[PDB]
Every structure is written in structure tokens, then in C-alpha cells.
Ligand binder design. Structure first.
Ligand SMILES: O=C(NCCCNc1nc(Nc2cccc(NC(=O)N3CCCC3)c2)ncc1I)c1cccs1
Ligand SMILES: O=C(NCCCNc1nc(Nc2cccc(NC(=O)N3CCCC3)c2)ncc1I)c1cccs1
Ligand SMILES: [Cl-]
Ligand SMILES: [Cl-]
Ligand SMILES: [Hg+2]
Ligand SMILES: [Hg+2]
Ligand SMILES: [Hg+2]
Ligand SMILES: [Hg+2]
Ligand SMILES: [Hg+2]
Ligand SMILES: [Hg+2]
Ligand SMILES: [Hg+2]
Ligand SMILES: [Hg+2]
Ligand SMILES: [Hg+2]
Ligand SMILES: [Hg+2]
Lengths: 605, 605
């Protein structure tokens, strides 16, 4: 267990972090403090041409650049080593190897990557440096003091740069590479070049699904992408315009910097479309107006501004058109603004990818098994993520529905008040006919003023019985009852996700062990069997979860969804009937407000 | 690396799980399946007296009992070994060694322990077995298929049993033993016996704070206990009555079983006292009434039933007195029922223990350092837990306040409607005087009917200007504005807990490493220094957090609290003024409803 060293540092050779053709990178410590540092060792241009170039890099001080502290000579050989900032978490590759990131990073995490990569790039540019090969392996992750990832660039030895940035982001967004010959790019270097050159403009992906088969191009992100629609719509054009073949038509940096900053500077407002059963993230600038917001909601919901009715924390939200977004109420995915419309809409629900388990190859193979373990574990994470979202959609629906009924009831109580505000006036100016009567053209005139008036009271008896009928429907036994939502679908107390997470955790441990078993080239007899046992356990665990997922989570969800679609239908019919009833109270009120002063007479002297 | 074995199982001797004077327990595998099992090996009563006793235990099938599968003979010696259910998570001791449990288990986790221990005990009793020594080391934890802990009893070879159960529960509830001589019970066996025998009845703890110093007795749980007040009030009497010295006065099992089942059968309703700034868990039976609920709230809040005003999801909650608790709205700690009162109450806020860091002993000592690492890490977890709760209290306050203003506004709109419901009637029966007038005891009579009536309209001008004044205070610029709550205290976006958690995680890793360093009796030169380095890092991390905790989390919280206390004061004054104004509209309404038919005259023929 020998180790090399320098005056200030030392490191086991076993503790290697990275290996390149030019150099190796190990994890060592400062001899005097014990502090962890990354050691970059060159095993090996004239000597002082380098002493100069070392100084300028030493000057680089930036958040999204791995810090170069010092340059030392190893002790046994004089070859140059680099003492660099150690990143305990690893790299973006490490992250992307996580099964829970098998279908892309969470949106929140993705945004940190975007931010930090871009800031690092610009700093390089601001100093004239070019990073010929950006890639997930170049991008280190560290935990910031606030618990948030901070990403930092390393290993740099400009349109060409935009390409590898593009591939990385697609990879980061989806967990997969955008350009995939069958089996592998390496396996099919030739198929890959045709794909990249023959890529039609605007396209962001190209997939060969069969051997020597055609390429499925797409301008859209896969369904399995976790990024919100709001973001996909913004992200997509950037990729399309930096993944352009003819460099004649490339976008350029300043434009690139502007378009990404415009995204990064946007805040997110969480919106839930109650009639479509769809959650939405609205990406909007602080200084954009509510008018623009409504337009943005329409783009994702197809609800025109005039039809957009807003609900927040159990009550209506009325936005001044020109109200800036930074002054809006605080929202989360869990606490969104609900949108409803008085116009019928198709109930969509959650759209997700139907993904089945890959087959498990019985042939014992350390490299194959570890690769397989990742894929099968990745699906369940996705399945677990979908299960969570389905529940969220149901929980939000249930909350929103509860709130809307109370809102309608407010309207109902508002209108009942109005009726009782015009009954009173009407009664007084009719009971004041008779009282004044008991004080034949006159009588011929008054009967009209009476009969016609008595028709209004008669018209209100027809309203009264109809409101009581709406009240009847809003009551617990009413046909618009809430009870069903708690009888249908799934609830937190079912703990289906936790039930799935237990299975995922057993599977994830085995995956990591298989990952370990791979690095050790050969197993002992016993360890060989255990690998084969746990291989079978993997499939058993995956099969149980999927059965549970489809039979329990999805099935009960679709039943809840079908009941909602019809229940919505009822709600819309009621509001329309109430509105008609509301307007009649207004029509009556103004007809009564003319016969109130219908006091006309002319008198002698 | 030799290993023993039997026909069906084998196990490394290095992989030991437990060690007793009679036997050792190792973790092994089934030879044919590879499945993990606990192996209990006896190194060593007549032979078949045992073959019989083995069969009855083999029959025991229970959820809270570790399963005994089979009994085999080791291969090299014929001494008897036991194949038992392996519990991957470990024991309650393991759990209690976690720094985040240094001050007791989370309430939810504690309840699973209570449930599972009791069910296991009863099963033993139901079969006549006695478990002479229950203890945290006897109690194994496994993850249930729903992600919830399942606890299972093992290693059994009845008032006396209630004692060790009692100590365990106090230990589980607080993270500490109830009876503690200075330094240690073992260290002071003699001081301990005096404490246990000389313990005054009713007491649940006894602590010697100085060497040869007195004992601080307590009948209450420590402030640092995480259990809700609702539970403490229920748990305390059980402990007091099973920690009784004179076994003459012990409680007995049937009573014990009844009292605990009565607790376990209770559901929890989350309540937040908005005026006291205190969260509460109400432990109530499904079949108990709202009447009883209100009584239960009074016990924790001192708000009498009549004064209890309920709010849920932004709107008033009106409970039928006899409404059963199982039909109540769903609550969480995050989504509680808010309680308010029209009567002044002292603002309490969160009550927690002020705990400072222990001193770190510079003397390198593997046993001492590991013990110290736990304590100092335990405090920060507690500090982290308090930070989270303080934020929760602030977030809930902010939400509740937002809701209450809207509720008052509903009242305000309800009353404005009423005014406009009695103005209309009043106007009609006054404008109908004049209109009827233009058709001297009579005139002498009417002026009264006019003047007195005109006083009511004059009285309503005084109301109108006063309501507009209340409206003025409820508006954004109003003196009862919300804005301050977002300017004061702390918010989720500050990420103070996450900032603290980062520090806690660095500290926790070192603790676990120190725990590892202890087990290995001696360190190499390098490993020796690193232990000393990380020892210093521990203190540095702890000091930074505490500074951040006191200066940032607590300080801003207390400012928010002080502003709330005064803001509440304003709110109460307004509701009282509104009520007075509301009642005047009622007083006026009935005085106007008498002069409406004040139409009296007698006529010839
Ligand atoms: O590849 C290269 N350069 C960039 C990479 C090497 N450089 C650094 N690497 C780290 N850190 C690091 C790296 C890898 C893995 C990990 N961590 C893990 O894998 N973990 C963590 C426990 C979970 C597993 C951490 N820090 C600072 C630096 I500078 C090069 C190749 C050739 C020349 S340069
Ligand atoms: O002490 C005794 N009897 C009860 C205890 C031994 N019996 C069992 N013990 C386990 N499991 C187990 C135990 C200890 C530790 C752990 N796990 C850990 O420490 N972990 C997990 C990784 C985190 C660290 C698991 N299962 C099943 C059984 I039966 C006895 C002493 C003498 C006679 S009997
Ligand atoms: Cl590097
Ligand atoms: Cl045991
Ligand atoms: Hg990490
Ligand atoms: Hg996942
Ligand atoms: Hg998940
Ligand atoms: Hg009139
Ligand atoms: Hg596992
Ligand atoms: Hg565990
Ligand atoms: Hg904690
Ligand atoms: Hg915490
Ligand atoms: Hg009248
Ligand atoms: Hg650490």
C-alpha cells in the first residue's frame, strides 16, 4: 500500500478519482492540516512557458470553476502535480448514474446545472479561455452551504463547444443521449456520423430502434422527461438552435447567453388546471404582467384569459391585469393556484410513458448485470415518481374541489342575499299599494300596476324553489357531493409510494453492490452465488412493484379520474343554472326599481 | 477468516450481531437459498427436556416476536445453535444511538414501539411466558413492507417486568435513563439503589446533578422530550404507576393493557392555538364527541368551549357538538385546525430547552471522544429540530392570520349586506310618510313618527363612517396589515434548516467514523492525526451552527413573535368594535320593524 507525496501533500494511489492519458487524479490530504484536496499528477513544451501559464490560471477565482490552489513537484520524480479543490460528491456523471435520475434530473436540480455551467463558461470567455471538451465527466458537484448543489467546471486543456454542451443538457434532461445508433455510438461510429450530419434542422434527437433500422427523429422532449411543460417549451428552442449541423446557422454565444439568462431569470408559478386535471409550472419574469400570465396559462391550458377563474387557499383570487408577478401569493407544487373555466374542457389527467421491465439476461456477466441493474432500477424510480405524482394530482383535485364548492356556496349566499334585498323593496311597494288604496280609470290603472307587479312575485316563487334545488344539490346528500373522491382513488394513508420505496431500496442496494462486484473483476465461489441470488431477487422485487403499481396505484387512479370527469360535468351545469338564476334576480330588480317611483299625479292649485 | 457452519447454514465469525455469556449471535446465510438469517450459537439440563421446550417456541407465530425457524447442530461440535429471523436494522438501542434520537424518538416512531412491545408482551402472557429482562437491546427493529418500523421481541430465557419496560419507555421518550446517579448507574450502584427505593411515589425520574449531590425528582417529562403535550399527559400516569417502589401498589397487567390500548386506539387531531402561538395534538377516541374535543382543547389551551372559534382551510369550521371524531376533516401538523378566541390570551410561543455544547476534552481518547461526538451531535439535531419547529410555527401563524382576516372580511361583508337590507326598508317607510303626507293632532303625531325615525337614519350615518373605518383598517395600508409577517421572522427560502443540516451531516459522518475508530482499538500514526483533526472540526462545525442558530433563527423568530403579540391585540379590539357595530344594526332593524306597520286608524261606517 505505497503512496506518493509532495512537500505539502500525500495520497494513496488506491484512492484514485480520475484517470487520463496525460495524468491521473487522486484524493489526498494536506500534510499540515489534514484537509482533503484533489491531486492531479502528470507522468509526462519548454519549462517556463508553463510557469507563466500556471500563474494566470491561479488567478481564476469563480464559483463555477474548481479552484486551483497550488502547483507542486512530486518527491520521487520531478514531474509536475496539481493541487486542486476536491469535490466529495463527484461529477454530473456520478449523479446521472443514479437510477432516480435515469430519466433526467429533477427540474429544480437541472436548473442549478444550467445556471452553474453557463456562469463557468462565460467566466472562461470573459478571460479568453476555451474548454474544448465540456462533458458530464468534466462537471463536478459539491454541496453548497445551503444544501443546494453547486456545479464547478474542471479538466480544460466557440460553436464546437455548444454541441457538447447541448448533448450534455439533453442527457441531463432525459437521462439519455440525444443521438443513439443501435447498441451504442462507439459500437456504431459510422451510423452516428450519418445521424449527426444527416440530422434534419430543428431536430433535437435521433434514435435507431432496430439494428440497421431507421432513425426516429423528434423535436420534442420524451414524455419520461421530468421537466415541466413550461420549461420544455423554453428549453427546446435553445437545443434545436445549438444542435444545428451547418455551423453557418449556428446561434452564437451572446444570443445563447441572453436566451438562457432569460430562462434563469424567470420565476415559477405553480398552477393546477382543475378541469383538465393537469399541473403546470408557469415560467414568468418578475416584471411581466398578469395579462401576460393569463396568456401563458392559455398556452398550457388553452383557456382564454376571459375564461380564467382563479382560486387560492380556499378563496377566489382576483388579479389586477397589471399586477407584477413578484407580488403574487407564494405557491408550491403542493400549494398551487387553481384554474377553472365556465366552458367545457376535455379531462386530460397525467400523461406519462408506459415503460415495461427489460428482460434479465440469465448469463452471469459482471459488466452486463451491473448495466442491467441500473436500467431495471431506473424504471421503478420512474414508476415511483409517477405514483407520487398521481397521488399529488388526486390530493390536489380533492382539495380544489372542496374549495370550489365553498366558493359556489359563497356565490349562492351572495345571490340569496340579493333576492332578500329585492323581495323587501318589492313587498313594501306592493303592500303600499293596498294600504294607499284603502284610503274608474284610476282603478283601471292600478290593477295593471298590481297584476303586472304580482307577476314579479309569482316569478320569484319560481326562483325560490329553484335555488332551494341548487342548495339541495350542494348539500351532503346532494348530487354534487364530495364523498366519492374519498371513496375513489388512493390516499396518503395507503402508503403506496412507501410500499414501493421499500422495494426500490432493496433493489438499489443490490444495484450498488453489483456496481461494486463489477469493479472487482472476479468473485470467490460464495460471492459468485450471492450475485446470482441477488440477481434473481432483483427481478422478483421489480415484478412485485410493477404489479402493485399497475393493479393498485394506476387502476384506482383511473377510476377516480373517470368519476371526476362526470362530476365536473355536473358542476358546470349547476353554475350555468345558477348564473341564469342570478341574472333573473338582476332583471327583476331593475323592473321593480321603476315601479317604485311610479308615483305620478297632477293637482289643482 | 474461518467460519463455522451447519448442514443448512454457514456464517463468518467476524459477522457477529450479539454476544452473551451463554451464547453468541452471528449473521449467516441459508446454504441453499443464500437468505440472511440470525444464527444463535450455544457453546454450553437433560437433552430431551429441551427437545420438548423447543417445540412450543417453534409454534409461536406473532408479528412482534422474532421468528424462530429451526434448531440445528453445528458441524464441528454438537453444541446446539438457533436459526432465527435476522433483523437488518438492528435494535431499539441502535436507534437510540442516533443523535437525532438523543432527546427521544419522534412521536410517530415512539407509538410504533409502544404498540409492538405491548402486543409482544401480551402474546407471551397469553401463552404463559415471562420475559425476565426486557430492554432496548432485546428489542429489534425491522422495516415493514409499508416503510414503517415493526418492532419484534427476542432473547427471553409479572410486575418486575413492568419496571424494565418503564425505564425503556422513559429512555425511548427522552433519549435518557430516568434514574441517573452522577457519572453512571454502574459507577454508582449504591447511589442508584437509594434512588430507586427512596423514590417518592408518583415520581418518574431522579437525577443527581453534582457528585454526592442531591436528586432532582420530577413527575413531568423534560422540555426536550419531543412527544406532544397531549401524549405526555396520557403517558405520564402510566409510568408513574408502573415505576412504583412498593410492589403492594403496583398496577398490574390487565389495567396496564387497558390504559395503553386506550392510548393506542386514540387518533390525533392537529390543532394550532393562534393567540398562544402553540401547536397541539389532541388525542381523542373515534367515538368521543366534539363536546369532549372542546374540553380536550381547553385542557391544553385554557380556552373554554364557548370561546373556541374554529378555522380550517381558510374558512370557519362549525362542529355539531355530537359529531364524532372519525368524521372530522383530515389534519396534519402542517394542516391543523386553527383555534381563536374573542377573549385576550397571553402569547406563549414555542417552549424549548436551552442547551449549550458540552466541552470537548482535548485528551485523545477513543472511548471518550466517541461518547462526546454523540452528545455534541445530539444537541445540534435538537437545535435543528427546534429550528424546524420555529419555522413551522411562523409559517402556520402567517397562514392562519391570512385566513382570519378573510373570515372577518366575510363577517364585514355579511354585516354590510344587513345594513343595506335595513336601509332599504327604512327608506321605503320614511319616503312613504312624505308621499302619503302630501295626500293638528295628526301632524303633531306624524312629526314624532318622523323625527324619531330620522334619528335612526342619523344613527346609521354614525355606523357607516365607522364601518368604512374598519374597512380602512382591513385594507393593505390598514393598521391591521399582513405585510409585517413577511418582513419579520424567517421563511423557507432562507434555507436555515438546510444550512444547519449541512453542518449536521459533516458532524454526523465524523461521529460515525469515531464510532468506527473506537471499535478498532488503536490507530496508525496517520489515522491518529486525522482523528485529532476531525475532533477539532467537530467543535468548529458545532460552534458555527449554534451561532447561526441563536443569531439568525431564534433572534428573527422572537422579533416576529413580539410583533404578533401586539398585532393580535389590535385584531381583538377590531372584532369587539365590529361586534358592537353588528349588534347596533340588529337593534336598529327591530326598532324599524315596529314602525313599519305603525299604521293605525279608525273610520266611520
Ligand atoms: O477526470 C478528470 N478530471 C475530473 C475528475 C477528477 N477531478 C476531481 N475529482 C473530484 N472528485 C471526485 C471525482 C470522482 C469521483 C468522486 N466521488 C465519487 O465517485 N463518489 C463519492 C462517494 C460516492 C462516490 C469525486 N474532485 C476534484 C477534482 I479536480 C481528469 C482526467 C484526466 C485529467 S483530469
Ligand atoms: O443480543 C442478543 N440478542 C438480540 C440481538 C442479536 N439477535 C439478533 N440480531 C439481529 N440483528 C442485528 C443485531 C445487532 C445489530 C444489527 N445491525 C446493526 O448494528 N446495524 C445495521 C447496519 C447499521 C448497523 C442487527 N437480528 C436478529 C437477531 I435473533 C443476545 C445475546 C445473548 C444471547 S441473545
Ligand atoms: Cl481535473
Ligand atoms: Cl436473540
Ligand atoms: Hg455526496
Ligand atoms: Hg425515483
Ligand atoms: Hg419516487
Ligand atoms: Hg314606494
Ligand atoms: Hg436488498
Ligand atoms: Hg436499516
Ligand atoms: Hg435532528
Ligand atoms: Hg432536524
Ligand atoms: Hg310601510
Ligand atoms: Hg465531514
Amino acid at each position: 500500500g505505497s503512496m506518493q507525496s509532495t512537500s505539502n501533500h500525500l495520497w494513496l494511489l488506491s484512492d484514485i478519482l480520475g484517470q487520463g492519458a496525460t495524468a491521473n487524479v487522486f484524493r489526498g490530504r494536506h500534510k499540515k492540516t489534514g484537509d482533503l484536496f484533489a491531486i492531479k499528477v502528470f507522468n509526462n513544451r519548454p519549462v517556463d512557458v508553463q510557469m507563466r501559464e500556471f500563474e494566470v490560471l491561479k488567478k481564476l477565482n469563480h464559483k463555477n470553476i474548481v479552484k486551483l490552489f497550488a502547483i507542486e513537484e512530486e518527491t520521487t520524480t520531478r514531474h509536475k502535480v496539481l493541487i486542486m479543490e476536491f469535490c466529495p460528491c463527484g461529477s454530473l456523471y456520478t449523479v446521472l448514474e443514479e437510477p432516480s435520475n435515469a430519466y433526467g434530473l429533477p427540474e429544480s436540480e437541472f436548473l442549478i446545472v444550467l445556471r452553474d455551467v453557463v456562469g463557468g463558461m462565460n467566466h472562461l470567455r470573459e478571460n479568453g479561455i476555451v474548454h474544448r471538451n465540456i462533458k458530464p465527466g468534466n462537471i463536478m458537484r459539491v454541496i453548497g452551504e445551503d444544501g443546494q448543489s453547486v456545479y464547478k467546471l474542471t479538466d480544460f486543456g466557440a460553436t464546437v463547444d455548444l454541441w457538447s454542451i447541448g448533448v450534455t443538457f439533453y442527457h441531463a434532461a432525459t437521462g439519455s443521449l440525444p443521438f443513439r445508433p443501435f447498441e451504442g455510438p462507439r459500437r456504431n461510429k459510422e451510423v452516428m456520423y450519418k445521424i449527426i450530419t444527416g440530422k434534419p434542422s430543428g431536430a433535437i434527437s435521433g434514435v435507431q430502434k432496430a439494428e440497421n433500422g431507421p432513425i426516429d427523429w423528434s423535436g420534442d422532449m420524451p414524455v419520461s422527461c421530468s421537466l415541466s411543460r413550461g420549461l420544455q417549451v423554453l428549453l427546446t428552442p435553445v437545443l434545436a438552435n445549438i444542435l444545428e449541423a451547418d455551423q453557418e446557422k449556428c446561434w452564437g454565444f451572446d444570443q445563447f447567453f441572453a436566451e438562457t439568462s432569460d430562462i434563469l431569470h424567470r420565476m415559477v408559478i405553480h398552477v393546477f388546471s382543475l378541469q383538465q386535471m393537469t399541473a403546470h409550472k408557469i415560467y414568468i419574469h418578475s416584471y411581466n404582467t398578469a395579462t401576460i400570465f393569463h396568456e401563458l396559462v392559455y398556452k398550457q391550458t388553452k383557456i382564454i384569459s376571459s375564461n380564467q377563474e382563479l382560486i387560492y387557499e380556499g378563496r377566489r383570487l382576483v388579479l389586477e391585469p397589471g399586477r407584477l408577478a413578484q407580488h403574487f401569493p407564494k405557491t408550491t407544487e403542493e400549494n398551487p393556484i387553481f384554474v377553472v373555466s365556465r366552458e367545457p374542457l376535455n379531462t386530460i389527467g397525467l400523461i406519462y410513458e408506459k415503460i415495461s421491465l427489460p428482460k434479465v439476461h440469465p448469463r452471469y456477466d459482471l459488466d452486463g448485470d451491473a448495466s442491467m441493474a441500473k436500467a431495471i432500477t431506473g424504471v421503478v424510480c420512474y414508476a415511483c415518481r409517477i405514483a407520487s405524482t398521481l397521488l399529488l394530482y388526486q390530493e390536489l383535485m380533492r382539495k380544489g374541489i372542496r374549495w370550489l364548492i365553498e366558493l359556489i356556496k359563497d356565490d349562492y349566499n351572495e345571490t340569496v342575499h340579493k333576492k332578500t334585498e329585492v323581495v323587501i323593496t318589492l313587498d313594501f311597494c306592493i303592500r303600499n299599494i293596498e294600504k294607499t288604496v284603502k284610503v274608474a280609470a284610476e282603478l283601471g290603472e292600478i290593477s295593471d300596476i298590481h297584476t303586472k307587479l304580482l307577476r314579479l312575485s309569482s316569478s320569484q316563487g319560481t326562483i325560490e324553489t329553484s335555488l332551494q334545488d341548487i342548495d339541495s344539490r350542494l348539500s351532503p346528500g346532494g348530487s354534487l357531493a364530495d364523498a366519492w373522491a374519498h371513496q375513489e382513488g388512493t390516499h396518503p394513508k395507503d402508503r403506496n409510494v412507501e410500499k414501493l420505496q421499500v422495494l426500490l431500496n432493496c433493489m438499489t442496494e443490490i444495484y450498488y453492490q453489483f456496481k461494486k462486484d463489477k469493479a472487482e473483476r472476479r468473485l470467490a465461489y460464495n460471492e459468485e452465488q450471492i450475485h446470482k441470488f441477488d440477481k434473481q431477487k432483483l427481478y422478483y422485487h421489480a415484478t412485485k412493484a410493477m404489479t402493485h403499481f399497475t393493479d393498485e396505484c394506476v387502476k384506482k387512479y383511473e377510476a377516480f379520474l373517470n368519476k371526476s370527469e362526470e362530476w365536473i360535468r355536473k358542476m358546470l351545469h349547476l353554475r350555468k343554472q345558477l348564473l341564469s338564476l342570478t341574472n333573473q334576480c338582476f332583471d327583476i330588480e331593475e323592473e321593480v326599481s321603476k315601479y317604485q317611483e311610479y308615483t305620478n299625479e297632477l293637482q289643482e292649485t
